[PDB]
Amino acid sequence: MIIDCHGHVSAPVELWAYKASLLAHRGSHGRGGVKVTDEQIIAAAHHKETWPDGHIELLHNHGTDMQLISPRPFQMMNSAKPARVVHWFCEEVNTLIHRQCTLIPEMFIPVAGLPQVAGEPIENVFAEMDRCVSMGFKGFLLNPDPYENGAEEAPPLGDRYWYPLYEKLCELDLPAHIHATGSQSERSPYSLHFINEETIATYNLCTSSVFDDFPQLKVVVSHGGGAIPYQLGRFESQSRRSKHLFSERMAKLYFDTVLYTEGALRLLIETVGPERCLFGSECPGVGSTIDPATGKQMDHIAPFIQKFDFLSDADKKLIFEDNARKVFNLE
Amino acid sequence: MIIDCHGHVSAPVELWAYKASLLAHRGSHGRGGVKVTDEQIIAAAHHKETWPDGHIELLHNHGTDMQLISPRPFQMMNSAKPARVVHWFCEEVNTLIHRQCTLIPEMFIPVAGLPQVAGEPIENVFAEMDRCVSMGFKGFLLNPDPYENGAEEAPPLGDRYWYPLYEKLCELDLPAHIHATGSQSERSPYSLHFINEETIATYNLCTSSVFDDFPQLKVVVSHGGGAIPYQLGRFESQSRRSKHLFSERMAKLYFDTVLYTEGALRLLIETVGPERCLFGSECPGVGSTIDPATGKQMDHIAPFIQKFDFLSDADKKLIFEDNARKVFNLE
Amino acid sequence: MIIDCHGHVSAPVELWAYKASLLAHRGSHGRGGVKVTDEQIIAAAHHKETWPDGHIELLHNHGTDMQLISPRPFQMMNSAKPARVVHWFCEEVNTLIHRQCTLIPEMFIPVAGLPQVAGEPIENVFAEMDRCVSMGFKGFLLNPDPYENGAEEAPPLGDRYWYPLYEKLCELDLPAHIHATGSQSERSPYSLHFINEETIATYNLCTSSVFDDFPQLKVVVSHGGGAIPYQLGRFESQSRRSKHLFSERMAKLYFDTVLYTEGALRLLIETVGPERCLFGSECPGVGSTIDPATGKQMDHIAPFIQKFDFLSDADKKLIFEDNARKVFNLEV
Amino acid sequence: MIIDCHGHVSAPVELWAYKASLLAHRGSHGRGGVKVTDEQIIAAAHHKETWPDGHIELLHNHGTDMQLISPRPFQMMNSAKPARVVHWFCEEVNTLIHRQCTLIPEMFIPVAGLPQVAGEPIENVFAEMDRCVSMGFKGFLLNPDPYENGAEEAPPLGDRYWYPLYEKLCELDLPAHIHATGSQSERSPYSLHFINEETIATYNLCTSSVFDDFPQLKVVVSHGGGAIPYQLGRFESQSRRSKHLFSERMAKLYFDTVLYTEGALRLLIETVGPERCLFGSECPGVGSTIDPATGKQMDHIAPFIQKFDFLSDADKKLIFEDNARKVFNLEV
Amino acid sequence: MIIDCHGHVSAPVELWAYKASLLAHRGSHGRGGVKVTDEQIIAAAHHKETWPDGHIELLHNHGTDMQLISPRPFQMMNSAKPARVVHWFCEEVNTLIHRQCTLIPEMFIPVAGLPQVAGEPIENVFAEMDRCVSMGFKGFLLNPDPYENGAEEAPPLGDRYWYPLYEKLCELDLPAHIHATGSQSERSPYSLHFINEETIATYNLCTSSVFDDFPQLKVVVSHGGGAIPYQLGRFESQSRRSKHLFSERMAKLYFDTVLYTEGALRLLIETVGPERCLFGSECPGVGSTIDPATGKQMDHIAPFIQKFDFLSDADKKLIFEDNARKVFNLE
Amino acid sequence: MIIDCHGHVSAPVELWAYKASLLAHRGSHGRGGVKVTDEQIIAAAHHKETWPDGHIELLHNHGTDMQLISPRPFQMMNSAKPARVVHWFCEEVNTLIHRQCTLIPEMFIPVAGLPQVAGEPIENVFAEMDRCVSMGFKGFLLNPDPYENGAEEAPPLGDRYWYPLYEKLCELDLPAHIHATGSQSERSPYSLHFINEETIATYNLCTSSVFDDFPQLKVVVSHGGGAIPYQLGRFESQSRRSKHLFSERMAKLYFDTVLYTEGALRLLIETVGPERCLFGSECPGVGSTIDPATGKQMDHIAPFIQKFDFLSDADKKLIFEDNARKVFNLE
Ligand SMILES: CC(/C=C(\[O-])c1ccccc1)=C\C(=O)C(=O)O
Ligand SMILES: CC(/C=C(\[O-])c1ccccc1)=C\C(=O)C(=O)O
Ligand SMILES: CC(/C=C(\[O-])c1ccccc1)=C\C(=O)C(=O)O
Ligand SMILES: [Zn+2]
Ligand SMILES: [Zn+2]
Ligand SMILES: [Zn+2]
Ligand SMILES: [Zn+2]
Ligand SMILES: [Zn+2]
Ligand SMILES: [Zn+2]
């Protein structure tokens, strides 16, 4: 089968209106919450909206059997104040993902957002993690820039600021899916910030002692590692002047295949090997447009991997399901 | 012949001491200047230093016949204060590069740094440009982040802040060579900041109307365009939702081949085409380490391009000299 | 008839989702816009939402014949970055209001928000004002604190920063309706910031030369003038030292009656007079809860004014329609 | 008798000069102190200053028998640096008040200021409180905005930042008298910031669990509660969603009657009841100007309360003495 | 006779209470002003207060015939906000000095404060200067640090920011008396800040083109030039590496003799010469204490100058009156 | 003999290049270190550079027999970021001074810089102190303004922030040598900042209870105490109003004689006494210019002190060696 490990929830419109409300009253109305029926959630999983077809129908047309759906990361406003609106909105997004996956278990698998408030100690997400574990969540999006390209930065991923999280992720044996959220920059909007932050997080993890101290830490890097597989040479060369090679740590990482050109998919898989690649597409999303040359949808990239003549059937099965089954502890 | 369009001056130690001195007295001793002889300038280009050999010796070994040399960008301190030390140090480095390329015209071709002070209008570099144009300089390093990964950032390259510079570059029909300088981030050291800044600059140039207003502007993006050829799919798909495709703007851009893996070189050349690639290696520097297994130096990448079977000998001539002669107006 | 001069649009949820999206991509998707059909705009004016009944049904129950609807001001994020998102959102809200008033003209009258970006010159709203003027809009919400209780504040209303706007309004003979937006303070939330900012704006206007320089300027202060009618004594006393009395300038101002206690309404009307009071309720909204002692909604305040012994039927007609009809240039 | 619970010290000019000097040398001359004789402290309570007559003469004319005098709060510079100057000045004002009440005991009762330094833990006032408690002081002015309308603000009164103080006050069975100090805003000067901060403090106290955790806490809000009695309806309505009604907590609060209009006094008394109103005038002060329509000083408000038809003589005795005598632990 | 050129007004207490009031209501009460009778001002000139005797009586005991009285500079709060309180308080101090000098013309001469608001253009003092010229004022205190040792600095005295003032001072042929005001620093309180700022202002004036561009500019530096006469050597040595000597400019400056040790007075006079020294004492003030060795008052320094055996009677007359007569255009 | 207690290392050019390199890569290349031979270290002390002659040659000519050398303070960049480059550069300069004084024990005696990072607790220098104590260092340069004339400043020297250091200095019975470093001010260049900071530090030490708590603490103030001996009168008069006279605290202090005018030298020695003066010249440096009239070099000041008639030969022995031997524990 084909399990897509990088998907984002198609939610009822009421969720985003709840965000607007929280930002309007900033808590003076109390927490409240999203009021939507199961019917409305299911219908949201079918609504066309801005995509060529519905979420479910698109996955069906592309042969994707199941998909791990997480929050749409650029809505999560990790730099917004006050902090409690960040926490509340994260919790409600997670609740809605849980409801949708319970209503549509034949396709959708839950992955959780973290209520990362810029500047707060990472411990402040543990409670929500616990709530999500009980609800059956299979992973967590880890944002390396809760400041959302502001004037300040979070510590690098090798800083012990993040160590309490790694510990917990190993106790649960659940993965962190690197994903930045929004960006306050006029130069670098969110979709490009994703790439730069993936590059930075990978670099941090591959030039620190994280994997010495948490050898079972499972990390999936979004969008084929940002820039790293393409730029691996300079970083390996510079890592020679040190006690560990960049590739030494990088061999511990997993990467999803959210890349919309055959050449990039080929380079990713040849660089890290099928043992460390998990099929992903972000369909529906950035890539849900039609290539005017072929008429196909750009995020319908499974056939590119299925036709690579340098991968065995075992390697393609690793990429399409087994790696996801292990990393996300899927039933 | 082989022309390397991305090299950095091996300078006598007195230049860096002059930088330190300027920062120490901050102008209270006057402008002063570097004090070195022609002999010391020539000797610097043969001294081993940390490299496996002298700059010129490594070029001779790798088969490189001429190299365009610019300042070592991470020393240019565009965010340093007061402004006058940034200007003065840029001026002295340019004067020294001029002296070296006049003393050794067989190997070296001069490329200038711009005295970009964070927050200053871009026109404040024009004077220095003129001076360098009178000294035979063939291009300019354009830093998209003169704030050097600080609390603030400059406007995106599509902003009209930069338009006075594009004008002048078209007036001179000379190219800009995109290259960041330092990085103040504890997460992102300068060598990774290079890549991210190239990604951002290319994105700005390909999502704005710069090339509609300056069709003749010549721009060379360093390090194979950061993440862009690898991440082209998502940005092209997103651009489909606008009036001009990312690809039609990117077709106007040139990229150098400072990539230290065969696979990345292949991906670059197959994505942008040999008509838009200029050979470059940054030898000596980040890539001047010996692969302990295969015995060769990582920045010795000309043979990779020579052996690509999908390139004709004319395509290889383009990559190795003709594009450089056209873009940098080489004699 | 009964005209309610202080109402806020009951809009389809797609509008608030559009706000969320604008904040999410900060303009990198383009302006885009609210995509919503006429039938959705109509249905939103009847949906119960968190109120006991729909907007229109409530106005019917309370006997209100027409309401001037403006944006829900605590959503207008005047302090948000980048500036273009606050401009775009204000514009979208204005056009949606225009559409709703065009579709339900027997009930709703359009009042526009201003795309006030904290720190921008006020002239930057004119382009939108002009547009709204050609769409038939009858007034503009004026926010004295576009910084939304931040680390900085805007100039007081007496400062010449605002004088271009005061000029244009007089050019148009259309009123400003003082209304604050959001509040970033952890001490003073938006509903209380409304009152504090009404107090500050009224004080600014009654201690400067705005009305000397703009005699025909029409200004309606929300929520019965905040604290001023209750605290008028101290301000009058301190003004005695000045060249003009506080009351001298205050008499040029209009106030709406959005007060949810009979005593407050009595004080307001007895303080500023029926010639300067315009009926308003903000129904549905903060006051749309049941007073258990009466069983009636707290914002069903028209009967209090109707049953005031100290007002003639002509004064009540001023409060309930004539004043609004003249201040907001309404048709008849 | 008539006890005025809101008065401010008429002090010799040497005190304000001492403030100026403290700001001038910022402590490099040492703490020093106000150097002023008993005769000067007495003379200051009779000097006309900018008022029509002396402090004591005015209180005599108005029929006030005793007044609780506290610091002039707009001078206490809680946002000034370095912290030690605000501490020293508060201490000096407190001791001068103590001396004046010791010299004129038939008229004046001491109420202390707190040396609140913006950003300091509240515990840093305890040492002064203790001292004032041993000097016979009967209450403390509590400033909810020691930042004085700056770029930052203090925690709301419901925050545990204030809980130590609430504890100590209950330990002492002495009241806090809500009063803001200065205002750095160019829109909202100090006299209006008083009202806005009273509104914010009252809202904080009526929407938190302060009175659940400190049931016997005695709090007197200045100037008739700012805007709250006039704007109570909206806050009650919004509180309905909470677990406690706004009025539920508001009933635990006391308010002084420093309002210079008959209508405002009527509203206050009818809203909170005579059991929670303490007569206060701030005479001499902002209200010490002549109402031309009456010839009487605007802060001569006791007759309004005396002539209210809807109050028994016993309710008026509560307002004029019993409530102050019980809240401020006064002798008889 | 003995004319003391550095004195500060002994004002009625009502002035400082007016300062406190302005800072309390910040303008909401309107400008207002100081209400004091002539009798009260005269009495203030006699009040003991904190000094061993009254101002007038102290000048009498020391043989000082007349004294130029200016504001007490550390009260002038040039960094306070809003600006109008700074302007108003300056104007009222000047009005009171004018009244006192008119009431006591047998001794007191008026010198004016400038309403210098940190960050405002210097032109904003011209109006008050004019008001003071009409009232007969003989000079102006010039503060080189209106920021009062804050996080920011004013431009150096050679910056053209100050040029409109110099121009005006030459049109009036009236002097600037360098005097800092207050200091917000915990390290360096006002009395020491005076010294450091005198040093900085002198350095600025002696390493810039001020005296090239305003050759008739009259400047009196307080407290014997801060540190400069004592430290003149290093600055002269460093000025040799430049187009003008430090002493070249320094010869244009005047210095007052507010120094309370014989050795410092000797060094000042021997360094700059009697032609450029104006007698000053700041009595009553910092120096109004008793030397327990001699019983004399430390600011009774006229006899030190009268007994120096290296000065002629003409030099002592230059120091004690003629220089003041010329510089301050005294009747 | 003549011992000069205020000299600064003439270092090989590679040290300043190492500073520039550290600032360029900000630690991403690791600590590294200066790479110079014993021969280059020795040659640096004989190279003319800008001086009229080599460092050692000038010392020989002036009659100086030994000199205590410390870092050139204006290069130590105590306000630079990140902290680790400040620490590393201080450590390398100290190691180089150690190498030079071990190679040339006839002339040079080692004095250490402190790795003071602005805002760091002072205890963060103790480690380095210990290392230097194991290398035979005889004192430490104490910078009162590690913020280098910035928006912020450190606590005054009387604040208990510094008390841990006083303790250690008494534990080692070694002295602090007050000396500022750089200055970010556009009004006050580093050479004037030296003087002002010495004034402030001396004032703090003489108006606080430091010497009541550390009676044995040894402190040497540079440049004759900035302004203090010249401005002593006002501060003594002000201190009379307190519990301890300025003079009784100042009597515990030592001062060096880095003054380039005879008159200032005289004033210093007559104010503080020969029992508290240590000869010092800062030769070569700011004072190494030739008086074009009198032919001699300005920092050749030993003869001035030799010719003072009011000093006995024992007083001159104190100034020229004994005080230095006692304070700096010289062998
Ligand atoms: C600035 C830079 C520096 C080095 O290569 C380098 C220098 C010294 C030691 C080791 C490496 C490279 C580039 O600009 C580039 O990568 O294009
Ligand atoms: C402002 C000033 C203050 C005093 O003189 C003073 C004031 C009150 C008590 C004690 C001293 C001195 C100077 O400006 C100067 O020293 O020139
Ligand atoms: C830092 C310093 C620098 C010079 O002397 C100097 C250096 C290079 C060229 C010219 C002068 C001196 C002192 O520390 C001092 O004055 O004590
Ligand atoms: Zn994603
Ligand atoms: Zn490069
Ligand atoms: Zn409203
Ligand atoms: Zn009061
Ligand atoms: Zn003075
Ligand atoms: Zn030195």
Short mmCIF file of all heavy atoms in Angstrom, two decimals, chain B residues 6 8 73 179 223 282, ligand 5:
data_model
loop_
_atom_site.label_atom_id
_atom_site.label_comp_id
_atom_site.label_asym_id
_atom_site.label_seq_id
_atom_site.Cartn_x
_atom_site.Cartn_y
_atom_site.Cartn_z
N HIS B 6 34.24 31.54 -9.14
CA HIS B 6 33.94 31.70 -7.71
C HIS B 6 35.20 31.35 -6.91
O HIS B 6 35.37 30.23 -6.43
CB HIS B 6 32.75 30.84 -7.28
CG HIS B 6 32.24 31.16 -5.91
ND1 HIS B 6 30.91 31.03 -5.56
CD2 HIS B 6 32.87 31.60 -4.80
CE1 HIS B 6 30.75 31.37 -4.29
NE2 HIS B 6 31.93 31.73 -3.81
N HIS B 8 38.06 33.25 -3.91
CA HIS B 8 38.24 34.29 -2.91
C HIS B 8 39.72 34.51 -2.66
O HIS B 8 40.50 33.55 -2.55
CB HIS B 8 37.51 33.94 -1.61
CG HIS B 8 36.04 33.76 -1.78
ND1 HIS B 8 35.29 34.52 -2.65
CD2 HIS B 8 35.17 32.89 -1.20
CE1 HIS B 8 34.03 34.14 -2.59
NE2 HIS B 8 33.93 33.15 -1.73
N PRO B 73 33.92 36.53 1.71
CA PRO B 73 32.74 37.31 2.11
C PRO B 73 32.49 37.36 3.60
O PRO B 73 31.97 38.37 4.09
CB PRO B 73 31.60 36.61 1.36
CG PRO B 73 32.28 35.98 0.17
CD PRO B 73 33.58 35.49 0.72
N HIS B 179 25.96 36.64 -2.94
CA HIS B 179 26.79 36.00 -1.93
C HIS B 179 26.57 36.70 -0.60
O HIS B 179 26.82 37.90 -0.48
CB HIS B 179 28.26 36.04 -2.33
CG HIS B 179 29.08 34.92 -1.77
ND1 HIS B 179 29.04 34.56 -0.44
CD2 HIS B 179 29.95 34.08 -2.37
CE1 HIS B 179 29.85 33.54 -0.24
NE2 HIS B 179 30.43 33.23 -1.39
N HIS B 223 26.70 28.74 -5.26
CA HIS B 223 26.44 27.44 -4.66
C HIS B 223 25.22 26.77 -5.30
O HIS B 223 24.33 26.26 -4.61
CB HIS B 223 26.27 27.57 -3.15
CG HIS B 223 27.46 28.19 -2.47
ND1 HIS B 223 27.40 29.42 -1.85
CD2 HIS B 223 28.73 27.75 -2.32
CE1 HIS B 223 28.58 29.71 -1.34
NE2 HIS B 223 29.41 28.72 -1.62
N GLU B 282 35.31 27.57 -5.46
CA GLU B 282 35.73 28.14 -4.17
C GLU B 282 37.00 27.48 -3.66
O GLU B 282 37.22 27.38 -2.44
CB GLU B 282 34.63 28.03 -3.11
CG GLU B 282 34.60 29.20 -2.13
CD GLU B 282 35.27 28.89 -0.79
OE1 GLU B 282 34.94 27.85 -0.18
OE2 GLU B 282 36.12 29.70 -0.36
ZN ZN G 5 32.17 32.08 -1.68
#
